Symmetry: C2
Subunit: 403 residues, 2 copies
């Protein structure tokens, strides 16, 4: 294949989600949906009476569901969060101002999302394609927690005053806004809960969101495919416009990202209504795009496979990454996987390479790494592979406490 | 050793928890604490201004923290939950009446509990003895979800009308109250989120909870040790009194329970205050009990080890149970454990034996088992070990859909 495309839809489930799902199904592909459950509560200020129907249809159809937080951080856009807050923030347009504030509260929003999903669909955990507790994406933010060495933030994603399309707006990646700094902490809290987070390469959207009637300004299928072609293997998160969609320190050429393109779009752009004629104009674009992307030799996949699943009978080179039971592992030596050689916290063939900061078993630590353990922070003084008896609090050779 | 004692403390963290912890530490034992985070919000109606101090002290001292739900189900004791609800329910004493109503909301209370703990102590996931997301116990309820074949419920734990001690109160284990039925669904929901739950063998309690000043009438250290000796290998959950603390269908002689006694008590019974002189009278009892228990050849352990942890080097017999990363596994073949042979979803040496009902990989299913998959129920038609290709919806020779 020329490469792998990951279609990711954000900010559902809403009414328009239903027809998007039908189009994917007709096109013979699976996508990943990053949902905000407040639409199930009827308070997300969209046409969303069919929210639960959409949720069920996505899972019944085999699409992957991931976590985009409960309320899309709207609680940071208003003084007091309530049933009208979505409408209030829509009135002001202040979604990317002060978007992140208290990182502990903001991270908790991702757990609340799961509570609400499991309330409206009590059987949701009986679906393997429900990945709401493993896969996440932060509102507004092109940020990544993929492996121990594949992590990077969207350093201009959100603002402390002006919107990115407003005159006089300035971002200094070397000195991120307060909101961005909080978003980085959220990333880290989620990673320690076992989440991976992923951003995107290309966004099927208007030029920017200051743009009026945005649903009417989506790129056509063929030029969008051209844009995808340009993204492939060109470190798109660093070159993408506008500036608040950038991931500045994205690890260019990192092997896990080779021959892949992650597409962001939004369910609500496929609705005929207050944003334009989305369903009439954009659903056929999505249909056509899938078609011509396959002809060009692309295949489509989901974010639960972005990091490839460990597979018996596959030959791995040393340093290759696999995903196993929601945890990332890195091959210690080149070898062919056997049934009883699976990655684990004691495997000789793999080390845990999750993007977390809490001290963890079977991790190859490097000098300078900082770990959290029993409420304290330790510097790795001597590079080593962690094991159960070498805990930071009692191994003075390996770890030095800060500070 | 004669046997293993598991001291389990319910309903903390409160002020009284602090000196309890000091006594455990002085006695050189570790214990398991089943906490309700509403005390950290200051609304649990106890002396709890030192709640956070207590939480931190328990974790710094190596004790295990388990999940007892956010509010101890007090939301089902009042018409509308708020800051006064603990006090309101303490005024009526209706805790065991309608204690469980909507199992989905009641289970969510356990998740809310973790949000609150991780809010007041943001570094709490850095403690390995934090087991809030793995180990639980239901308020009021001697209920168990340990393995696929070790599961049982407290069939008279809570009522649909009167207090258990009241005249007129009737309990029929063959026709459990609605509150009990709801609590059973709570167990199943928690199990499907990967929780184990455990009840207790003996309860260090007042003579009777029906009458005032319960802290004063706690059994002395020596006679309590005799209660423990008597409970050893005697299936105490079936013989325990009163009827409301019983686990009627507890699996007598089940292998994981051999030579073990789980003790229940409550932190608040060790406080000088509204329940009596608990600190003055009962702390010494606990100090003595630990001393003489050890002297009699008992060891003390924590609930994270109740199901023994898989350990490299140890030799296992076919049929033996281990715990590995919060998941219960059962040995397929007798062997000595090696580094590369951790139990998992692909191991040929172990099968998954978690107490869950959702279809799960690498489970040894038997004819008659019932599983949930993608929102539907299936009956196992022929015995087999589950694997990725053999999903219920595609294997009608192995599974039969239930209408
Ligand atoms: C300069 C520029 O355009 N930057 C783009 C970012 O704005 C954009 O983030 C997305 O922004 C839009 C608009 O602010 C978000 O849409 C809002 O979503 C909320 C919740 O669904 C909804 O209540 C609002 O109505 C809706 N606003 C409008 C005007 O329709 C959208 O969710 C943001 N994206 C993510 C992943 O959270 C990013 C990504 O498109 O692109 C930048 O170029
Ligand atoms: C008929 C009989 O003896 N039943 C016993 C049960 O009462 C007892 O379960 C525990 O009961 C106590 C007393 O109600 C519960 O205490 C309450 O706990 C809440 C929340 O922490 C607190 O707000 C109330 O003030 C407090 N009541 C009092 C009088 O102090 C306690 O939570 C129950 N236990 C558990 C694990 O949830 C059981 C076990 O001791 O024995 C029964 O026989
Ligand atoms: Mg993970
Ligand atoms: Mg578990
Ligand atoms: Zn979004
Ligand atoms: Zn309790």
């Amino acid at each position: 294949p020329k490469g792998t495309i990951y279609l990711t839809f954000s900010d559902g489930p809403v009414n328009a989600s239903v027809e998007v799902i039908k189009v994917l199904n007709q096109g013979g592909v699976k996508a990943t949906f990053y949902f905000n459950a407040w639409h199930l509560d009827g308070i997300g200020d969209e046409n969303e009476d069919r929210a639960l129907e959409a949720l069920k249809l996505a899972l019944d159809s085999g699409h992957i569901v991931g976590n985009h937080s409960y309320d899309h951080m709207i609680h940071n856009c208003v003084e007091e969060f309530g049933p009208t807050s979505g409408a209030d923030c829509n009135a002001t347009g202040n979604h990317q101002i002060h978007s992140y504030q208290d990182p502990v509260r903001d991270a908790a929003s991702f757990e609340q999302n799961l509570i609400t999903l499991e309330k409206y669909l009590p059987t949701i955990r009986s679906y393997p394609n429900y990945k709401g507790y493993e896969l996440a994406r932060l509102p507004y933010t092109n940020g990544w927690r993929v492996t121990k060495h594949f992590q990077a933030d969207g350093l201009c994603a959100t603002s402390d005053n002006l919107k990115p399309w407003e005159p006089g707006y300035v971002c200094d990646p070397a000195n991120p806004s307060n909101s961005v700094k909080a978003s980085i902490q959220v990333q880290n809290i989620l990673a320690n809960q076992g989440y991976q987070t992923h951003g995107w390469d290309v966004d099927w959207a208007p030029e920017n969101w200051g743009i009026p009637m945005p649903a009417n300004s989506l790129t056509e299928a063929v030029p969008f495919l051209a844009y995808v072609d340009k993204a492939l293997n060109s470190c798109s998160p660093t070159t993408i416009e506008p500036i608040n969609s950038k991931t500045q320190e994205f690890p260019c050429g990192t092997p896990l990202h080779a021959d892949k393109v992650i597409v962001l779009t939004h369910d609500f752009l496929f609705e005929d209504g207050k944003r334009g004629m989305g369903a009439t104009q954009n659903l056929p674009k999505l249909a056509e795009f899938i078609r011509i992307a396959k002809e060009a030799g692309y295949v489509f996949d989901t974010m639960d496979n972005y990091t490839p699943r460990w597979s018996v009978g596959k030959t791995y080179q040393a340093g290759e990454y696999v995903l196993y039971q929601g945890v990332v592992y890195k091959a210690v030596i080149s070898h062919t996987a056997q049934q009883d050689w699976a990655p684990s916290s004691t495997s000789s063939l793999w080390t845990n390479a999750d993007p977390a900061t809490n001290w963890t078993l079977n991790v190859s630590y490097e000098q300078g790494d900082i770990v959290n353990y029993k409420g304290k922070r330790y510097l790795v003084s001597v590079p080593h592979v962690s094991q159960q008896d070498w805990t930071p609090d009692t191994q003075n050779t390996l770890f030095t406490a800060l500070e």
